[PDB]
Design a binder for this molecule. Structure first.
Ligand SMILES: OC[C@H]1O[C@H](O[C@H]2[C@H](O)[C@@H](O)[C@@H](O)O[C@@H]2CO)[C@H](O)[C@@H](O)[C@@H]1O
Lengths: 514, 22
């Protein structure tokens, strides 16, 4: 990471150009160049590169991912003095607090709202239950009632949560990670309603962010569900739109997750003090937040002074009304694995790969297996590639034994089958990031004859280590943990049942015992 | 079966050898 320079990562749907403009005012005053980037999958990439001491100086994401970052040592504790802390709303500081420390600067409060085309639908529905009849009416006219992103569970969560879904139970000052709330009647009722819309052809299971945004901004669909960042492209489209409270389901408010967009500082940055100066004295000011907001609306900002100025905006009022119906996201380190598991459940139910009930029943153990598997497999592939064991801490006994097993068994596979593994690598001709992403097709082919056993599982992880050694060799070391993640995904997404029956990683250690 | 299919199938054969061994 370059000293005397700031590199900032923010998601590509946010106002990164406005933020880069704030960066230019910083550079003007200081000589420090500010580079703003919007990598894909940055919320997964950031912990990967930061773990090796690289990556951006500053990372922007909703607050739900930062607990996991902090737990892994990847974030600097920030040090705002009392006067600065008083300039932002107290509940936004609460969102960026982890094990008693501030780990990020709060920027803005986000919640999803219903966005509707006033020319197609001046009186939008108050209930989800009305949408099928409305869609059938709009189809006779060449239109559709509603399109929104079905590939990210963030967007279906308001409906799942409406009748009782929840992520983790909060009781006695603590989230209880053993009490996950998607395998209950209300969550199932909400997701069933969503899958019925798809089954009856009011919705298409393949709809993603880009498709829904294009349809609404082209006036092809009467409604969408999206956050404040989306308002600016609608302005450009000259669709005449309103932003309103989400529909009710079984008479209950939709309950969107509330995110606080937050800016954390890399623990590996040599520019911590410059980062603090940029965030406190340039970004978190009326003029700094205005430049970002004019690019893509931020929502209800954390800075009291500027939020008072925008609060008259009726679109912000609707955001805050949906937010009050919803719930602030937990920030515990299990949130990443939760989202992995709920994303699979929603996509599986929507597509018919599983029933609604089976899909949500799997989610909890899927999240626990994912988290444990990802750590084991990622640690093995990294130590194989670098020659050095990771000293950071760890379900920890089992994960320690599993990794000891891999050093013996996985190393053994790579010894005995080196000639095969070398020809496989030559044949695949891995050069770049797309090459590595495409290996998920290899992994599925390992299991396509329908057989699963521990030997195939360990061989796939062993080949993953073999490929990872090669990736460091060609200066693509950052691709190692995406590889580990795709191996982990194939195993948990398609072999969850088998892993559970075989006692997971305890069974793995047992099977390969000397 | 194609190139990625061939690799994947050889990984399965190797895995079955390992499975039998252990
Ligand atoms: O879909 C799971 C996803 O939900 C949230 O991400 C939101 C984000 O908060 C919004 O700012 C916006 O970018 O859309 C994202 C959904 O695509 C969680 O914050 C994130 O951790 C989680 O993976």
């Amino acid at each position: 990471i370059e000293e005397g320079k700031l590199v900032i990562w923010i998601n590509g749907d946010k106002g990164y150009n406005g933020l880069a403009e704030v960066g230019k005012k910083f550079e003007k005053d200081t000589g420090i160049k500010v580079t703003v980037e919007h990598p894909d999958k940055l919320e997964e990439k950031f912990p990967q590169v930061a773990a090796t001491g690289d990556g951006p100086d500053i990372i922007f994401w909703a607050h739900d991912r930062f607990g996991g970052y902090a737990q892994s040592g990847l974030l600097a504790e920030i040090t705002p003095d009392k006067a600065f802390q008083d300039k932002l709303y107290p509940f936004t500081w609460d969102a960026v607090r982890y094990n008693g420390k501030l780990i990020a600067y709060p920027i803005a409060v986000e919640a999803l709202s219903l966005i509707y085309n006033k020319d197609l639908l001046p009186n939008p529905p108050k209930t989800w239950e009305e949408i099928p009849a409305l869609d059938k009416e709009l189809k006779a006219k060449g239109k559709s009632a509603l399109m929104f992103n079905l590939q990210e569970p963030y967007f279906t969560w308001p409906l799942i949560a409406a009748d009782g879904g929840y992520a983790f139970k909060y009781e006695n000052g603590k989230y209880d990670i053993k009490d996950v709330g998607v395998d209950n009647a209300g969550a199932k009722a909400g997701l069933t309603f969503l899958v019925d819309l798809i089954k009856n052809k009011h919705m298409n299971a393949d709809t993603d962010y880009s498709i829904a945004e294009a349809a609404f901004n082209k006036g092809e669909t009467a409604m969408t569900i999206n956050g404040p960042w989306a308002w600016s492209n609608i302005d450009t489209s000259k669709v005449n739109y309103g932003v309103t409270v989400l529909p009710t389901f079984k008479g209950q408010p939709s309950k969107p997750f509330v995110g606080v967009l937050s800016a954390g500082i890399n623990a590996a940055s040599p520019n911590k003090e410059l980062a603090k100066e940029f965030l406190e004295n340039y970004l978190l000011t009326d003029e700094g937040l205005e430049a970002v907001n004019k690019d893509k609306p931020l929502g209800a900002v954390a800075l009291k002074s500027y939020e008072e100025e925008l609060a008259k905006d009726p679109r912000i009022a609707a955001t805050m009304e949906n937010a009050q119906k919803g719930e602030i996201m937990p920030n515990i380190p299990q949130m990443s694995a939760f989202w992995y598991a709920v994303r699979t459940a929603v996509i599986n139910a929507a597509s018919g790969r599983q029933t609604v009930d089976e899909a949500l029943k799997d989610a909890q153990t899927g999240s626990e297996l994912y988290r444990q598997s990802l750590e084991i497999i990622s640690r093995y592939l990294r130590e194989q590639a670098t020659g050095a064991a990771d000293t950071a801490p760890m379900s920890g006994a089992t994960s320690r034994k599993a990794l000891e097993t891999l050093r013996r068994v996985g190393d053994g596979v790579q010894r005995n089958h080196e000639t095969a593994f070398q020809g496989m690598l030559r044949k695949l001709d891995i050069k770049n990031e797309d090459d590595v992403k495409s290996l998920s097709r290899v992994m599925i082919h390992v299991f396509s004859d329908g057989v699963t056993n521990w030997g195939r599982i360990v061989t796939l992880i062993s080949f993953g280590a073999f490929v990872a050694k090669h990736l460091k060799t060609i200066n693509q070391e950052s691709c190692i943990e995406p590889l580990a993640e795709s191996i982990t995904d194939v195993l948990v997404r398609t072999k969850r049942d088998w892993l559970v029956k075989q006692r997971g990683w305890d069974g793995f250690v047992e099977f390969f015992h000397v | 079966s194609s190139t990625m299919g061939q690799v994947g199938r050889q990984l399965a054969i190797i895995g079955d050898d390992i499975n039998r061994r252990y």
